[PDB]
From Swiss-Prot:
Active-site residues, record numbering mapped to chain: 197 (proton acceptor)
Organism annotation: Bacillus subtilis (strain 168)
Molecular function via GO: acyltransferase activity; gamma-glutamylaminecyclotransferase activity
Listed EC numbers: 2.3.2.-
Protein name: Putative gamma-glutamylcyclotransferase YkqA
Gene that this sequence comes from: ykqA
Length: 269
C-alpha cells in the first residue's frame, strides 16, 4: 500500500540518508510545498503566515520503507501535505521535527551556497548556451570550460515564462528528453547567474539535475527552472537567435532541428 513521500533534506538524492529509500521510484525530481525550511539536520515548519515554499522530491515508498524511516527519524512526526509538481498537485507524506531559516526553501541550494561549492557544473538549455550576453557582462571567461553536450532524460525544453515580448525557456519534468550544454564554472560565477535568472524576484529558481555528458554521469548539476509556468508562446526573435546559435554550436543536429521547429510552431503572444 505504497505511499507518496516528499523529501526535502537528508533523504534527497545524493544526500547522506538517501540509501534508506532503497529502490523507491522517484516520481518527481522537481516538487514543492508551501512552508518554511530550517537548518536545526534540516526540518520544516508550517504556519499560516508562510508565503514561500519548501523544495524537494517525491518518491513512491513501500510500507517497509516508511517503517524504516519511522525508526531512523526518532523525534520526528509525519503528516501529509499537498505537493505542487510540474504535472499536477499530489498528496504526500512528509517528516518534521517540532534553528535558522533557509530563505530559498531548498536544502541543496543551501548546501551549494553555504559550502561555496567549487566548481559548479552548470546545465544550460536556452540562451545561456550562447556567449554574447556573457561577453557583454564581462563574464565569458567563466564559460570557456564547457564539458559539452549533455542529455537530460525526463524533461522537455518549453517556453513557459511569459514576458511582454514573448516567452523565455524552461524545462518541464513531463517525461520528455532534452539536451543542453554543461559548463564547469567557478563558484565565483554564480551570483551573475542568480541575477541573470531573476532568482531574487522569483523569476527562476535554482534547481538540480543529473546529466550525461561525454559518456560520464554528472550529479547535482545546477540549472534554473521557471517558477510561474504559463502555456507556451513563441520566444522573441533576438532571444530565439541566441538559443539557435548555442544549440548549433553544442547540441545534436536532430535535437536542434526539433527545438527550432518547436519554437517556430508556437503562437505569438
Amino acid at each position: 500500500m505504497n505511499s507518496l513521500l516528499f523529501v526535502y533534506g537528508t533523504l534527497r538524492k545524493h544526500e547522506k540518508n538517501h540509501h534508506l529509500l532503497a529502490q523507491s521510484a522517484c516520481i518527481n525530481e522537481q516538487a514543492r510545498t508551501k512552508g518554511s525550511l530550517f537548518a536545526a539536520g534540516p526540518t520544516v515548519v508550517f504556519n499560516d503566515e508562510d508565503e514561500g515554499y519548501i523544495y524537494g522530491e517525491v518518491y513512491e515508498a513501500d510500507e517497509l520503507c516508511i517503517h524504516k524511516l519511522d525508526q531512523f527519524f526518532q523525534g520526528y512526526h509525519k503528516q501529509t501535505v499537498f505537493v505542487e509538481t510540474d504535472v499536477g498537485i499530489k498528496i504526500a507524506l512528509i517528516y518534521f521535527m517540532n534553528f535558522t531559516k533557509i530563505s530559498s526553501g531548498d536544502w541543496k541550494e543551501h548546501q551549494m551556497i553555504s559550502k561555496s561549492k567549487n566548481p559548479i557544473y552548470y546545465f544550460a538549455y536556452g540562451s545561456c548556451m550562447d556567449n554574447a550576453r556573457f561577453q557583454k557582462a564581462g563574464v565569458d571567461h567563466y564559460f570557456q570550460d564547457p564539458v559539452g553536450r549533455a542529455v537530460l532524460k525526463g524533461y522537455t525544453t518549453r517556453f513557459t515564462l511569459k514576458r511582454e515580448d514573448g516567452s523565455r525557456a524552461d524545462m518541464l519534468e513531463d517525461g520528455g528528453t532534452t539536451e543542453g550544454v554543461l559548463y564547469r564554472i567557478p563558484y565565483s560565477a554564480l551570483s551573475y547567474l542568480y541575477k541573470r535568472e531573476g532568482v531574487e524576484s522569483l523569476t527562476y529558481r535554482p534547481a538540480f539535475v543529473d546529466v550525461e555528458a561525454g559518456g560520464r554521469h554528472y550529479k547535482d548539476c545546477l540549472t534554473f527552472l521557471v517558477l510561474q509556468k504559463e502555456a507556451e508562446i513563441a520566444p522573441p526573435q533576438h532571444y530565439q537567435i541566441e538559443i539557435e546559435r548555442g544549440a548549433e554550436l553544442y547540441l545534436s543536429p536532430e535535437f536542434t532541428e526539433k527545438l527550432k521547429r518547436h519554437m517556430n510552431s508556437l503562437p505569438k503572444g
